[PDB]
C-alpha cells in the first residue's frame, strides 16, 4: 500500500511528523522543534530550546549580558588584567538580528580570543561580515570574518584560532585604565 | 673661557670633534659618524656603519634580499610551514625611501609569526609614514597598521613586546596558499 515514511530528525525533541524522503530536509530546516544549546560561554548553562527562544533565554537567565543597538558599536571589556580565565559577552542588535560578541581570556601567560556569532542559521550568517578593531596611539589591529552561527558555536573556531587572537602584551598596548575597547562593525555582504 | 674638552661619542667611528661637555649632546644628535647595526634579521651579520652606508651594505652583502618598487605590494613568503626559527626579508622602495619588511617565525608549544616594517632612516623620518600589513583569505582578513620603526630603534624590542602583527601557525593556515603566505604591505604618508 503506502510508501515508507521517515521520522523528522527532531522527533526526540517532540516532532511527530513523518515524511517522504524528498520532503525530509525541507521540513527539518523549518522544524520549530529543532533544539539549540545556550550560546553563553562556556560551561555553566544547560538550557536548550528553540531558535526563537534563545534571545528570551539570554534576557531572562543572563542579565549581566548587555545588548547594544546599531551596526557599529564599541564593546568596552573592563578589567582585562584582573586574574584568571575570564569571559566578556555582549549582544548587538542590527539588521533584524542579534549577534553575540565574545571575548575570552585563556591562561597558557594569557591570551585573548574575540569572535562574533549570529543567533540565526549558517545561511543567514553568510550574508554578514563582522569587523573587530583595536585602536591605540598610531596603532590598529583589525580582524574581519563571517560570524559563526549558534549551531556551529564558537568553541571550535577558538580552538582553531579562527578569530581575533592576541596576547597580554597586545591587550596592554591597546587598553586604557585597565579596559580594552573593541570597535565592532557588522555589515551586509 | 678655560675649558675641558671631550671627544664626541662616535670618535671610534671616525669623528674627530672635541668639545666642552655642555655642547657634546647637541653635536652628537646631528653627528654623521653615528653607527647603525646591519638591520637584516636575526643574529649573523656584525657589520656596523653610518646611515648612508646601510643601503650599500645591504646591496653588497645581502644580495639575496629582493626589492620591489611600489607603495602597495605583495610580499610572498615561501614555505611558511618550515619548522623552527625562520626569517623572510625584503625591501620596499617608495616615497624616496627604502623600507625593510620582516616576517619572523619564532619557537614553548607556540610557534608564532611576527611581521613588522622598519624604515632605513631616522625616527623623525619614520614619523611621516604609516604602514599596513594585511593577510587575506577566504572571507577572512587580518590587518595591522602602525608607524614603521627606524633602524636605530630596530625591531627586536618591538617583537619582544608584540608591537607588530603577531599570528600563530594555526591562523596562518587561513591565509596560506600552496605553502606560501602573501602579505599585502601598503605604505602611506601621514
Ligand atoms: Cl608609543
Ligand atoms: Cl583612518
Ligand atoms: Cl646612540
Ligand atoms: Zn520536525
Ligand atoms: Zn543559558
Ligand atoms: Zn661627532
Ligand atoms: Zn649585514
Numbering used by the authors:
A (entry chain A): 91 to 198, 202 to 282
B (entry chain B): 91 to 197, 200 to 282
What does the paper say about this structure?
Siah1 (seven-in-absentia homologue 1) is an E3 ligase belonging to the RING (really interesting new gene) domain family. It acts as a scaffolding protein and interacts with a variety of different substrates for ubiquitination and subsequent degradation. Siah1 functions in Ras, DNA-damage and hypoxia signalling pathways, and is implicated in various cancers. The SBD forms a dimerization interface with its counterpart from the partner subunit to create a Z-shaped structure.
Two isomorphous crystal structures of Siah1 were determined at 1.95 and 1.58 Å resolution. There are two molecules per asymmetric unit, labelled chains A and B, and they form a dimer consistent both with the observation that a single species of approximate mass 39 kDa was noted during size-exclusion chromatography purification and with published structures of Siah1. The electron-density map was very well defined in the 1.58 Å resolution structure, apart from one loop region (Tyr199–Gly201 in chain A and Lys198–Tyr199 in chain B), and these residues were excluded from the model. A Ramachandran plot shows that 97.4% of the residues in the high-resolution structure are located in the most favoured region, with no outliers. The degree of NCS is more highly conserved in the high-resolution structure, in which the superposition of chain A on chain B (171 Cα positions) results in an r.m.s.d. of 1.36 Å. Superposition of the two new structures on each other gives r.m.s.d. values of 0.80 and 4.89 Å for chains A (175 Cα atoms) and B (164 Cα atoms), respectively. The high value again occurs owing to a difference in the position of the N-terminal zinc-finger subdomain in the two structures. The result is that the Zn2+ ions are displaced by about 14.5 Å when the structures are superposed. The overall molecular packing in each lattice remains well conserved and it is simply that there is space that allows the N-­terminal zinc finger of the B chain to adopt a position where it can either interact with a molecule at 1 − x + ½, y + ½, −z + ½ as in the highest resolution structure or interact with a molecule at 1 − x, 1 − y, z as in the case of the lower resolution structure. The notable conformational flexibility of the N-terminal zinc-finger subdomain may contribute to its role in the biological function by adapting its position to assist in interactions with distinct substrate proteins.
